PDB file of C-alpha atoms and ligand atoms in Angstrom:
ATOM      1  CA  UNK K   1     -34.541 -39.227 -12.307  1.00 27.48           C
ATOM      2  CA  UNK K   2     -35.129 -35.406 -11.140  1.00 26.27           C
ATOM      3  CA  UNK K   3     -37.211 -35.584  -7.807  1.00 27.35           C
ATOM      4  CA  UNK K   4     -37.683 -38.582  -5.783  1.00 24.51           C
ATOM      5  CA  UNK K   5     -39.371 -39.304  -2.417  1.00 25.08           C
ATOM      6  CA  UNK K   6     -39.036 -42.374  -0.657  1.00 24.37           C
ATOM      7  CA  UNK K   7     -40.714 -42.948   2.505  1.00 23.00           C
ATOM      8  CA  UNK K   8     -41.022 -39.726   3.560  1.00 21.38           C
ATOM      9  CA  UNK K   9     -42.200 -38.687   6.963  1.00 22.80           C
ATOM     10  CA  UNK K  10     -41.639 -34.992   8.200  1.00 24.61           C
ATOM     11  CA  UNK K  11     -42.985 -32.847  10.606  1.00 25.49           C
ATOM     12  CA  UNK K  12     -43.530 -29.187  11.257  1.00 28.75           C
ATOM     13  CA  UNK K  13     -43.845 -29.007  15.027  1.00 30.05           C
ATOM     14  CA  UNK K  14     -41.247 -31.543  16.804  1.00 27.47           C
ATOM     15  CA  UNK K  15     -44.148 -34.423  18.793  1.00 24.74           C
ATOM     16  CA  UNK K  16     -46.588 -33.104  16.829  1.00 25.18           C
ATOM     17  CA  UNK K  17     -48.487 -34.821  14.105  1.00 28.18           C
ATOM     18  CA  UNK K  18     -46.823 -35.763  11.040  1.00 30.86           C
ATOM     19  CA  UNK K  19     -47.719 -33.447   7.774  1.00 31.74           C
ATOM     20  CA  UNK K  20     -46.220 -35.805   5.756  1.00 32.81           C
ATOM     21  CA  UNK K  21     -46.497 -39.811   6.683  1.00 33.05           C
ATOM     22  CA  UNK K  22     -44.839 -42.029   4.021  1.00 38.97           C
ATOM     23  CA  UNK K  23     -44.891 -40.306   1.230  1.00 39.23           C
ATOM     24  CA  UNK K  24     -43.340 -41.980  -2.225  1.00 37.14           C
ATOM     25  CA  UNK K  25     -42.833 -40.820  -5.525  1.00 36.29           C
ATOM     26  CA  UNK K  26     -40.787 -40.343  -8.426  1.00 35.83           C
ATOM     27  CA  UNK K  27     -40.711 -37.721 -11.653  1.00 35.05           C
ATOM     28  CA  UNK K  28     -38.395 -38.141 -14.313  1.00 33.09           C
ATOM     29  CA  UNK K  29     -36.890 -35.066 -15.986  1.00 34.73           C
ATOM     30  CA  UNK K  30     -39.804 -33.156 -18.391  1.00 35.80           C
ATOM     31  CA  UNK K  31     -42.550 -35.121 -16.327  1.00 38.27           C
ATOM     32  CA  UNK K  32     -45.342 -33.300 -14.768  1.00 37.84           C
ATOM     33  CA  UNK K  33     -46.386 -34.572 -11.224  1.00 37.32           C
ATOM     34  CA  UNK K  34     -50.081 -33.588 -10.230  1.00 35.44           C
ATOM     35  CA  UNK K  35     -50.334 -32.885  -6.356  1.00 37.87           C
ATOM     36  CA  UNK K  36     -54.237 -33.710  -5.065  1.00 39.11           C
ATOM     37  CA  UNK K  37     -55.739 -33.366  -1.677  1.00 40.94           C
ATOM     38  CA  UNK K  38     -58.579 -31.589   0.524  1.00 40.06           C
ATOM     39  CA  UNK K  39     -57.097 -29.041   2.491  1.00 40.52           C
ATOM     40  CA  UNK K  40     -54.591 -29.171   5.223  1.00 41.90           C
ATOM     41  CA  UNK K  41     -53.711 -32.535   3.701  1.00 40.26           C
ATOM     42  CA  UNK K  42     -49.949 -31.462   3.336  1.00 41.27           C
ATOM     43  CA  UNK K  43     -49.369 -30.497  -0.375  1.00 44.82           C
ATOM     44  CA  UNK K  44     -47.482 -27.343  -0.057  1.00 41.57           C
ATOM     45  CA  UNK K  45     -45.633 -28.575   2.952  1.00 46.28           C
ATOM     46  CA  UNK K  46     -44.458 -31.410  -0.114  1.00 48.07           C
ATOM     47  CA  UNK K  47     -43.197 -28.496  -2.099  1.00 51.17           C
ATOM     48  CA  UNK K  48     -41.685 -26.813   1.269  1.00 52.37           C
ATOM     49  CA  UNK K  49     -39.937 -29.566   1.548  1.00 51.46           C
ATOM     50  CA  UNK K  50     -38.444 -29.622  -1.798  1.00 55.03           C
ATOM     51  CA  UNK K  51     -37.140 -26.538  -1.414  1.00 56.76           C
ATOM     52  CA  UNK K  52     -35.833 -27.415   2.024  1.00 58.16           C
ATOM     53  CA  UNK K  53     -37.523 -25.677   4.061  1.00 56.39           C
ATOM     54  CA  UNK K  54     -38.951 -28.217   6.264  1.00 56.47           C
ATOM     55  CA  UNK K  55     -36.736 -31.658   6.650  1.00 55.66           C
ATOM     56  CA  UNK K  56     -37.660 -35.309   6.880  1.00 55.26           C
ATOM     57  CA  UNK K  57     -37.540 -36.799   9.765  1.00 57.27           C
ATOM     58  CA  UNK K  58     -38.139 -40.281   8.075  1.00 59.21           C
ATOM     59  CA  UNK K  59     -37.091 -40.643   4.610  1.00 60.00           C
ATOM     60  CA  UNK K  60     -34.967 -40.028   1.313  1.00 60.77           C
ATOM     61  CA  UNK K  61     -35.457 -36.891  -1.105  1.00 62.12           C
ATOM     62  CA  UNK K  62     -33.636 -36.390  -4.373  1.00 62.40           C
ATOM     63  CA  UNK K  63     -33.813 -33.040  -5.916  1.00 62.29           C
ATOM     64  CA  UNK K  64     -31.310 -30.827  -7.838  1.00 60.84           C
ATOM     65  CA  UNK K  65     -30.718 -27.782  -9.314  1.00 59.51           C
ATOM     66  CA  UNK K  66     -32.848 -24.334  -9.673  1.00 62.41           C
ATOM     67  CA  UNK K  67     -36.306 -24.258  -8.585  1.00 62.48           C
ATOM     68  CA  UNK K  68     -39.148 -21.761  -9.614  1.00 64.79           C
ATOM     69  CA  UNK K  69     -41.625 -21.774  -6.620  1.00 62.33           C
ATOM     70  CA  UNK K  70     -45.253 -20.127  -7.842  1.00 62.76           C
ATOM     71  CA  UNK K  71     -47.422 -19.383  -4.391  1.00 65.59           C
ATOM     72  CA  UNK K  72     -50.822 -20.582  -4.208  1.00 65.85           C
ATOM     73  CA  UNK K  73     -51.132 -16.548  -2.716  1.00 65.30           C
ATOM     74  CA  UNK K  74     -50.870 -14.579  -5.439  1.00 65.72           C
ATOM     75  CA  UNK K  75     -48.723 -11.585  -4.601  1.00 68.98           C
ATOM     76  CA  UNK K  76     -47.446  -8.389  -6.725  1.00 65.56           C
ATOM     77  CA  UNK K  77     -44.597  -6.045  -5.576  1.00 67.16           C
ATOM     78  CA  UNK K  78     -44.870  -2.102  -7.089  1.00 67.76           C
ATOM     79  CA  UNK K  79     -43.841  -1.865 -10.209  1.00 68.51           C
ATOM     80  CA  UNK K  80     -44.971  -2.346 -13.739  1.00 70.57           C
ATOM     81  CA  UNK K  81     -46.749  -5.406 -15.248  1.00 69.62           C
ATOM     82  CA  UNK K  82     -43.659  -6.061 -16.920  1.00 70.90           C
ATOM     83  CA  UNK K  83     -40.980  -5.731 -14.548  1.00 70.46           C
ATOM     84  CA  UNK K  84     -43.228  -7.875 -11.699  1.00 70.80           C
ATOM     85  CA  UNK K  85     -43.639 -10.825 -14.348  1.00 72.71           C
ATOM     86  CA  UNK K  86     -39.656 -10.542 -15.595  1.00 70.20           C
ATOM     87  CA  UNK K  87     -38.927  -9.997 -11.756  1.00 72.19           C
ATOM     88  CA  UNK K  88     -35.080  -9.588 -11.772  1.00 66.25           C
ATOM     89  CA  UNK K  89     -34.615 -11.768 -14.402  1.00 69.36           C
ATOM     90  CA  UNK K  90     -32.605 -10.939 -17.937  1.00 69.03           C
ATOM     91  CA  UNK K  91     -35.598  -9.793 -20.097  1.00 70.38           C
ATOM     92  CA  UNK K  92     -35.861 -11.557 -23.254  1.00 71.40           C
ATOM     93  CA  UNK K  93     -38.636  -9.964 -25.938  1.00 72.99           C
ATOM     94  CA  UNK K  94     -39.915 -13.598 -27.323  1.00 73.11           C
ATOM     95  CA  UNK K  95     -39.631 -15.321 -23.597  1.00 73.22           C
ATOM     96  CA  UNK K  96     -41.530 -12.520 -22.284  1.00 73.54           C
ATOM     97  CA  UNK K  97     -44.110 -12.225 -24.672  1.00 69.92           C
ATOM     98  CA  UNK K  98     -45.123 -16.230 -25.055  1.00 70.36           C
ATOM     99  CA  UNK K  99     -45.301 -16.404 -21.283  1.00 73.80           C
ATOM    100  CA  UNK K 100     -47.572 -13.582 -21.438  1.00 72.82           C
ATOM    101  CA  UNK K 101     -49.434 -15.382 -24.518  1.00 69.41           C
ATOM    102  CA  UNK K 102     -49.546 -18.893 -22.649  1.00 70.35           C
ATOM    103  CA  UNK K 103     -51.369 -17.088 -19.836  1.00 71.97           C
ATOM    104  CA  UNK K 104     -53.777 -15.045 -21.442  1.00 70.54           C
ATOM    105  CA  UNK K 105     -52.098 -11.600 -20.352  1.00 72.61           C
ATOM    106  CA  UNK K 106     -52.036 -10.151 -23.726  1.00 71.29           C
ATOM    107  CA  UNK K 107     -55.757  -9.524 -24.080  1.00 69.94           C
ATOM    108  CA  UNK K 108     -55.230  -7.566 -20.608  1.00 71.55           C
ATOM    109  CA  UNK K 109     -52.533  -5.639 -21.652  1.00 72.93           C
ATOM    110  CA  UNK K 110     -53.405  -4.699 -24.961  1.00 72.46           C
ATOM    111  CA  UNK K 111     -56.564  -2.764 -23.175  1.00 72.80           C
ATOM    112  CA  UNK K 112     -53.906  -0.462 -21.405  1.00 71.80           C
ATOM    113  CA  UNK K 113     -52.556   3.135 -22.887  1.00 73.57           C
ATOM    114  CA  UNK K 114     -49.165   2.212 -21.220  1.00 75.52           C
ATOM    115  CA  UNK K 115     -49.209  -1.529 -22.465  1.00 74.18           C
ATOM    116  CA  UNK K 116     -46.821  -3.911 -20.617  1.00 75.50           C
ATOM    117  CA  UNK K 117     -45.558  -0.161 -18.481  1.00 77.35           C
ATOM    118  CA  UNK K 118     -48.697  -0.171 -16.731  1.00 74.84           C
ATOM    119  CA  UNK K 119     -47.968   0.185 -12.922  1.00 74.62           C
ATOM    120  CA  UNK K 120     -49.584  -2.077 -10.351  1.00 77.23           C
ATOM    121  CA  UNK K 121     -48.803  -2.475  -6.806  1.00 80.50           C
ATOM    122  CA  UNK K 122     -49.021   1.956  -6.358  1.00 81.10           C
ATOM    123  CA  UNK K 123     -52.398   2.603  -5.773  1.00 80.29           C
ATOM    124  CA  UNK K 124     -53.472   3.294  -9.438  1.00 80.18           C
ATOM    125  CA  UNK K 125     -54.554   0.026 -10.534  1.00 78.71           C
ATOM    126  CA  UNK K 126     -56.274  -2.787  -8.739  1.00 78.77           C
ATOM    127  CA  UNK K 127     -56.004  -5.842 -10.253  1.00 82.22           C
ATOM    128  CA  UNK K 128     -59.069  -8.817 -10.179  1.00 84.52           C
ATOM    129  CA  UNK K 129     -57.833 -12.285  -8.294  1.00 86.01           C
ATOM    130  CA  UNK K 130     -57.675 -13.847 -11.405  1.00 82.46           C
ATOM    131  CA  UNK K 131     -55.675 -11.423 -13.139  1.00 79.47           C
ATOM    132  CA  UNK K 132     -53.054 -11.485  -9.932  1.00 80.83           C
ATOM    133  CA  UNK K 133     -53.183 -15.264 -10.528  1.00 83.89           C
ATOM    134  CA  UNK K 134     -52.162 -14.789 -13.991  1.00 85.11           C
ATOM    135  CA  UNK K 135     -49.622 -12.460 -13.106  1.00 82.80           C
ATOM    136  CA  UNK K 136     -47.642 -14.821 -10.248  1.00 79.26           C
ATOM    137  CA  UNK K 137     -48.110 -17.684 -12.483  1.00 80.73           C
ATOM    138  CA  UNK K 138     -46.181 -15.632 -15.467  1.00 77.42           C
ATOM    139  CA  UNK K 139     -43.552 -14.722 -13.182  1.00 75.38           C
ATOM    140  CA  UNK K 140     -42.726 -18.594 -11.805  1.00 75.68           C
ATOM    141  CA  UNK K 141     -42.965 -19.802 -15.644  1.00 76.51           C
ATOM    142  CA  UNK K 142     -40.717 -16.940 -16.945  1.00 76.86           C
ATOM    143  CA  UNK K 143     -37.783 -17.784 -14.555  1.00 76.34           C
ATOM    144  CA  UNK K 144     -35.201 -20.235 -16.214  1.00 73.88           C
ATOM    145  CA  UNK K 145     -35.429 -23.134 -14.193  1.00 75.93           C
ATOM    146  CA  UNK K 146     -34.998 -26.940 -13.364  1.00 79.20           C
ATOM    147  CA  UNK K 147     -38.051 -27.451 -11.318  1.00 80.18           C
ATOM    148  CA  UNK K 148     -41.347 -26.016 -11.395  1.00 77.56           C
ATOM    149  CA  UNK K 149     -43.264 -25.522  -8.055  1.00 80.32           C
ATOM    150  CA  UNK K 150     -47.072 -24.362  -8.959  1.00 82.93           C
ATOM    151  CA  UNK K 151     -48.951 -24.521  -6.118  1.00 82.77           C
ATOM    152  CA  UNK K 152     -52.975 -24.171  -7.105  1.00 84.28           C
ATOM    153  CA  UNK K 153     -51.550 -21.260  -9.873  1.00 82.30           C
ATOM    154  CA  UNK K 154     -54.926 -21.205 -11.394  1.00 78.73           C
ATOM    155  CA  UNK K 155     -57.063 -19.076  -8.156  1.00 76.10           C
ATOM    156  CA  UNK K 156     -60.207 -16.926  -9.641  1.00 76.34           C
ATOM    157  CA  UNK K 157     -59.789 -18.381 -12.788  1.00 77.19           C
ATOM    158  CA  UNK K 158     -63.177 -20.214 -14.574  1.00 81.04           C
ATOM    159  CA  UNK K 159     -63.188 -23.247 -15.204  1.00 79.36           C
ATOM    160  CA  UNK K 160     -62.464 -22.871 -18.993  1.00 78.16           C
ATOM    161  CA  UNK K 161     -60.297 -20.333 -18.461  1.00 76.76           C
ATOM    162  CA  UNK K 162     -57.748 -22.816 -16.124  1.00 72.70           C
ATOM    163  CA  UNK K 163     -58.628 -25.856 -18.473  1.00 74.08           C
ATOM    164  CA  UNK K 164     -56.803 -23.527 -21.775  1.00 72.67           C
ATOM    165  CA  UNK K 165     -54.169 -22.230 -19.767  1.00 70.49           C
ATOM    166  CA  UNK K 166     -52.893 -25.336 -18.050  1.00 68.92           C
ATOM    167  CA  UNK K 167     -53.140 -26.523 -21.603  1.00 71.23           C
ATOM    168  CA  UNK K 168     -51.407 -23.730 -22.897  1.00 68.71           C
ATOM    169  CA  UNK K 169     -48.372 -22.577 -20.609  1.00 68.53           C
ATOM    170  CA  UNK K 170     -48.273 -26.566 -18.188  1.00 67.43           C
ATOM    171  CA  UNK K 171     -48.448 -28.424 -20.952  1.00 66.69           C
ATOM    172  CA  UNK K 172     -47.329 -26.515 -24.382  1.00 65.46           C
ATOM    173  CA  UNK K 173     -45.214 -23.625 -23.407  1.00 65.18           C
ATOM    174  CA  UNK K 174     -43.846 -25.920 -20.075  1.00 65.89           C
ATOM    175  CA  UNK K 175     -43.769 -29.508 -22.365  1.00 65.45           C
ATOM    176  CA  UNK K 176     -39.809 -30.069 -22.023  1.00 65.54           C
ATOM    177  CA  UNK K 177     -39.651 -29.213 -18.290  1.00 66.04           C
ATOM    178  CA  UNK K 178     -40.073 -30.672 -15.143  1.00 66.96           C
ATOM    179  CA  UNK K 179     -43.250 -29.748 -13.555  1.00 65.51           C
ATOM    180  CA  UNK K 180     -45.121 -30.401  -9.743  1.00 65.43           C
ATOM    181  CA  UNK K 181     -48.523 -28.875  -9.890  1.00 66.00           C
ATOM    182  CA  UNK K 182     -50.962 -28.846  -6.917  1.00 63.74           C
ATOM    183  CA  UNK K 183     -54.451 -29.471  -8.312  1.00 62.81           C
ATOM    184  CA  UNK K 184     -57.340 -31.076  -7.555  1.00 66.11           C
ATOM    185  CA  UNK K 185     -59.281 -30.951 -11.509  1.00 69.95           C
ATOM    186  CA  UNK K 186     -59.560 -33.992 -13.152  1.00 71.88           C
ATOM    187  CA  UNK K 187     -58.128 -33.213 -16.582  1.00 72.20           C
ATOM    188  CA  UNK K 188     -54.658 -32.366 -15.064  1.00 76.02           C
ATOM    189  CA  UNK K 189     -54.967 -35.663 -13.205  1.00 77.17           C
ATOM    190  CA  UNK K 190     -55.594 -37.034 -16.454  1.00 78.81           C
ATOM    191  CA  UNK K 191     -52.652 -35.356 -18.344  1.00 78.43           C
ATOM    192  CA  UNK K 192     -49.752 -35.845 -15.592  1.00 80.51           C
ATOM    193  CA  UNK K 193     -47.513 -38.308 -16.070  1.00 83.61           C
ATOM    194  CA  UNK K 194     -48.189 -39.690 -12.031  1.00 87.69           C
ATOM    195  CA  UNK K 195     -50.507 -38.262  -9.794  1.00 86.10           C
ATOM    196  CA  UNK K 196     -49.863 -37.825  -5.753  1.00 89.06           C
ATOM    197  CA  UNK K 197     -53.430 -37.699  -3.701  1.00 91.30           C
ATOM    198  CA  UNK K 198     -52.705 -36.324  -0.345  1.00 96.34           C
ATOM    199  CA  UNK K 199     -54.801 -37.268   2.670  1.00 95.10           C
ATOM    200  CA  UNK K 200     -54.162 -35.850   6.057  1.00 95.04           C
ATOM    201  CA  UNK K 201     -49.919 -36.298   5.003  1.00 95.46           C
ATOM    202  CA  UNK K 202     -50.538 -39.498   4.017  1.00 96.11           C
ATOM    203  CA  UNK K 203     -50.831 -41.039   0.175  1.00 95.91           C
ATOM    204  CA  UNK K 204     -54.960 -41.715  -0.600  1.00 96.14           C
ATOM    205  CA  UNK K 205     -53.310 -42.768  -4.064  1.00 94.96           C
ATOM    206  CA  UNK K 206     -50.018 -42.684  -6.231  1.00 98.97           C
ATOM    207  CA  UNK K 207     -49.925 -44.128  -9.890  1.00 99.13           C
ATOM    208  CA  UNK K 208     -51.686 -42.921 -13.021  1.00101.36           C
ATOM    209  CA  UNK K 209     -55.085 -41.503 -14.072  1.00 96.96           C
ATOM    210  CA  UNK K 210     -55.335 -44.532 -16.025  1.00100.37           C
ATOM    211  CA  UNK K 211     -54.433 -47.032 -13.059  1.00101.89           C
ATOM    212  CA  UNK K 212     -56.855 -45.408 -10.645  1.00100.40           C
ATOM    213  CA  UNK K 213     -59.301 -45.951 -13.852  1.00101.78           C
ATOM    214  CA  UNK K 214     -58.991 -49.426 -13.815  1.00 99.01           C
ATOM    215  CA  UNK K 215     -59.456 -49.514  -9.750  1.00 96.67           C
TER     216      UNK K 215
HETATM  217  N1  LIG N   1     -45.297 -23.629   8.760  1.00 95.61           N
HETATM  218  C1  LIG N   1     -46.399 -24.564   8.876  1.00 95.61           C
HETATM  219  C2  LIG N   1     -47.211 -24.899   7.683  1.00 95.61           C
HETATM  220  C3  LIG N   1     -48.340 -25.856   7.796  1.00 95.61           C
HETATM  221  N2  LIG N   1     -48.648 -26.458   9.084  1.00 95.61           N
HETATM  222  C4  LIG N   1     -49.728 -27.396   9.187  1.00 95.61           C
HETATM  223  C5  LIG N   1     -50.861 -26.909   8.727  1.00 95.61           C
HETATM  224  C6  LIG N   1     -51.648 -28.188   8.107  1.00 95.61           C
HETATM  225  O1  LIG N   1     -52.409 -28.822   9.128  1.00 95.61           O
HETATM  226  C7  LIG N   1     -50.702 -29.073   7.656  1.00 95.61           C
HETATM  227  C8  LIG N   1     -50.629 -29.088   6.139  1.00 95.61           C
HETATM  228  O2  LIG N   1     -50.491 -27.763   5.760  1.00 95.61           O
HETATM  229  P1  LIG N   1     -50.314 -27.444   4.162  1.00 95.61           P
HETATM  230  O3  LIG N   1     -50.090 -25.958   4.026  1.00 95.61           O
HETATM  231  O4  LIG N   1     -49.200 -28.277   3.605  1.00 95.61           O
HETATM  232  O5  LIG N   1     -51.729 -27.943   3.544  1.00 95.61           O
HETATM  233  P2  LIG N   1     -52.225 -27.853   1.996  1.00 95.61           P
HETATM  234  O6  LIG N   1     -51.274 -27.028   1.182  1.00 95.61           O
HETATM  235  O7  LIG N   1     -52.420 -29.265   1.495  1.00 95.61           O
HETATM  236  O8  LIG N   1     -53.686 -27.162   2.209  1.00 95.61           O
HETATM  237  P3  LIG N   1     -54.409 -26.075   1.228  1.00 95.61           P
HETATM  238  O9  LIG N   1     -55.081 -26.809   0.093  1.00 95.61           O
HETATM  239  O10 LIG N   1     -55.453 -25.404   2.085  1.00 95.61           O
HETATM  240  O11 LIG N   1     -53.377 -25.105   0.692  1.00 95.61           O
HETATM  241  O12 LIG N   1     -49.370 -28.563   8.165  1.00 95.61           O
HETATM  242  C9  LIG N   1     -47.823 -26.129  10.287  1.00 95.61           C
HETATM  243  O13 LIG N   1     -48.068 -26.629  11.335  1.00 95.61           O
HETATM  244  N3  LIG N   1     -46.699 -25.170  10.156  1.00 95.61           N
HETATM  245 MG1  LIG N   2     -51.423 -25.175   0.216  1.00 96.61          MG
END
């Protein structure tokens, strides 16, 4: 087992309403836990949480170990394409360059003089949304981690565009690791191994695609 939550109840103001009423789950290592739910319905307070920065005031939660937390605000810091998606982290030539690959950064790179050296964040460039999506979801997936936080990673991106990259870096490139992804798009509710609908901190629904099918 690598995250649990059992009856969860948390809140972010103390007397106020709860963000989170009740909430249960589980994800075994290498699973991939789809996060659903109109807004304000509490699904990045759930990854908050996980990385403790907001405590239950009802509740168990089991997590361990390093955590890669992608924003659903995609941000960049100056710096080249390269260094913002390696961030700190050892560089590695074949880790870098299938991350890259898995989210469709190589076609924009490859259109540059100064390739992967290409500055952003300085005033020369300005990147589109989606290619700042892109960007912040290469730099979560590149760090080495235990636990993968993307919260709605896919912003600006068409639809087909999100469908082959969820395929390609959630599901290939990310296939042994264990994975929470806030989304609302049916074919990631589809592919998770549970799914976690959100309603106003409550859960609408937990189970599988193929439960809520037979409902
Ligand atoms: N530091 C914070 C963060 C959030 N909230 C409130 C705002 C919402 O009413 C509720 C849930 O906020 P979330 O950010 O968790 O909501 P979502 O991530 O589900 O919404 P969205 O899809 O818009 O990102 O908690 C708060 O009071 N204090
Ligand atoms: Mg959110």
């Amino acid at each position: 087992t690598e995250v649990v939550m059992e009856n969860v109840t948390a809140f972010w103001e103390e007397g106020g309403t709860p963000v989170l009423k009740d909430i249960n789950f589980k994800i075994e290592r290498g699973q991939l836990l789809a996060v659903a739910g109109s807004t304000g319905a509490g699904k990045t307070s759930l990854l908050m949480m996980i990385m403790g920065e907001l405590e239950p005031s009802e509740g168990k939660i089991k997590h361990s170990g390093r955590i890669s937390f992608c924003s659903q605000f995609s941000w960049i810091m100056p710096g080249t394409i390269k260094e913002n998606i390696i961030f700190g982290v050892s560089y590695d030539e074949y880790r870098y360059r299938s991350v890259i690959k898995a989210c469709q950064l190589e076609e924009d790179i490859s259109k540059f003089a100064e390739k992967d050296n290409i500055v952003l964040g300085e005033g020369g460039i300005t990147l589109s949304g989606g290619q700042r999506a892109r960007i912040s979801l290469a730099r979560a997936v590149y760090k080495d981690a235990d636990l993968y936080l993307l919260d709605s990673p896919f912003g600006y991106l068409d639809v087909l565009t999100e469908k082959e990259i969820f395929e390609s870096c959630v599901c290939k490139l990310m296939a042994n690791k264990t994975r929470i992804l806030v989304t609302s798009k049916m074919e990631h509710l589809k592919k998770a191994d549970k799914i976690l609908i959100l309603h106003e901190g409550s859960s609408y629904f937990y189970g599988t695609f193929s439960e809520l099918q037979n409902l």
